Amino acid sequence: RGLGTARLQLVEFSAFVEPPDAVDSYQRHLFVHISQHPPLESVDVRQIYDKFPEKKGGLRELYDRGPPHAFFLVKFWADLNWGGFYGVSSQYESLEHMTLTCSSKVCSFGKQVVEKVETERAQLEDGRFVYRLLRSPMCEYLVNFLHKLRQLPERYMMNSVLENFTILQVVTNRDTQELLLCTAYVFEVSTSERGAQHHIYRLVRDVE
């Protein structure tokens, strides 16, 4: 129905830039945004194996580890129409008290180029636990990437570059090493006039 299981739901995800201005009058630009404050379409995981690494922490090894219902594909239309602060903010919820490990991998032509690993202990909210990874500074690699992408002279060239750029997020129970959520991200640029959009799929593999 949405990005999440009964065990862990994504409330909100965004990657953004706050101009130096923002101290005077506060602005933020969203490169991409999901808020989850009708069942999903499905995509065969086999069709995207090669956009991600092989061996450990590759999509095939992770899917075999399971559980299979925990795997999602997000297609983003990134808004690239904008020395500020580059940030990433993630919020999850559960009925269960856990310590999460959240691993984010950037891949270029299916190869790992940069990885960020964060742990977040649960905090009590109104009849649920919340995991708040807010305003995490964007790594130099992606800030630099976004500045270059911004400057290409055609949208189709931006989309051709993004064809070979993916992100894999794996959220695990730090204590039991159970996988809770695995999200593969693929990317296109939005038009000049349109903001960030996404489509969420279930990732499936034929039992057959």
Residues that bind ligand QZ1 (CB under 6 A): 15, 31-32, 78, 88, 104-106, 114-116, 138-139, 142, 162, 167, 187
The separation between the first and the last C-alpha atoms of the chain, rounded to the nearest angstrom, is 24
Q: What is the smallest separation between the CB atom of 171 and ligand QZ1, expressed in angstroms?
A: 12
Q: Which residue has the tokens 């279930």?
A: 202
| CA–CA distance, 92 with 17 (Å, rounded to integer) | 22
Q: What is the smallest separation between the CB atom of 200 and ligand QZ1, expressed in angstroms?
A: 14
Nearer to ligand QZ1 (CB atom), residue 114 or residue 130 = 114
Q: What is the smallest separation between the CB atom of 43 and ligand QZ1, expressed in angstroms?
A: 19
Q: Give the SS3 label for residue 20.
A: helix
Q: Give the SS3 label for residue 42.
A: strand
Nearer to ligand QZ1 (CB atom), residue 50 or residue 115 = 115
Nearer to ligand QZ1 (CB atom), residue 70 or residue 78 = 78
Nearer to ligand QZ1 (CB atom), residue 152 or residue 204 = 152
User: Rg of the Cα trace of the chain?
Assistant: 17
Helices (DSSP H) in 70-196: which residue ranges?
A: 140-151, 155-162
| CA–CA distance, 137 with 84 (Å, rounded to integer) | 11
Q: What is the smallest separation between the CB atom of 156 and ligand QZ1, expressed in angstroms?
A: 15
